[PDB]
From Swiss-Prot, chain B:
Duodenum, heart, lung and liver, but not thymus. The Lon N-terminal domains are crucial for the overall structure of the protein, maintaining it in a conformation allowing its proper functioning. The AP-domain (ATP-binding and proteolytic domains) has a closed-ring conformation in the presence of AMP-PNP and its N-terminal entry gate appears closed. Upon ADP binding, it switches to a lock-washer conformation and its N-terminal gate opens. Belongs to the peptidase S16 family. This is Lon protease homolog, mitochondrial. The chain holds residues 784 to 838 of 959 of the full protein. It is linked to CODAS syndrome: A rare syndrome characterized by the combination of cerebral, ocular, dental, auricular, and skeletal features. These include developmental delay, craniofacial anomalies, cataracts, ptosis, median nasal groove, delayed tooth eruption, hearing loss, short stature, delayed epiphyseal ossification, metaphyseal hip dysplasia, and vertebral coronal clefts. Signal peptide: none annotated. ATP-dependent serine protease that mediates the selective degradation of misfolded, unassembled or oxidatively damaged polypeptides as well as certain short-lived regulatory proteins in the mitochondrial matrix. Endogenous substrates include mitochondrial steroidogenic acute regulatory (StAR) protein, DELE1, helicase Twinkle (TWNK) and the large ribosomal subunit protein MRPL32/bL32m. MRPL32/bL32m is protected from degradation by LONP1 when it is bound to a nucleic acid (RNA), but TWNK is not. May also have a chaperone function in the assembly of inner membrane protein complexes. It is found in: Mitochondrion matrix. Homohexamer. Organized in a ring with a central cavity. The ATP-binding and proteolytic domains (AP-domain) form a hexameric chamber, while the N-terminal domain is arranged as a trimer of dimers. DNA and RNA binding is stimulated by substrate and inhibited by ATP binding. Interacts with TWNK and mitochondrial DNA polymerase subunit POLG.
Amino acid sequence: HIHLHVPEGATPKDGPSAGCTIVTALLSLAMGRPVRQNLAMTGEVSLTGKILPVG
Amino acid sequence: LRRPQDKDAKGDKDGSLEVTGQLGEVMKESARIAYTFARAFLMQHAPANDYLVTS
């Protein structure tokens, strides 16, 4: 079990658009490698790693 | 405390919090956050104790 938190401030439609980071969080938490420093990222994903556009 | 703690040495269920004091919701999620973090700090700090998870 893993508690998770994403800070509020995004408009609701943007909620999913952050989602691509979540898996990265999961992966870094899982495998344990810290993610590479100074590397932002964003975008939505459609249930199998395909990426989608965002405004 | 809400129930006697050592009901079973072998038990495994969340030691559920009960928030009270006419909380606004934002405070409730923050409480959940602090709750989990405290429980983490314990296992990180004094692993032998289990008083939080077990009650």
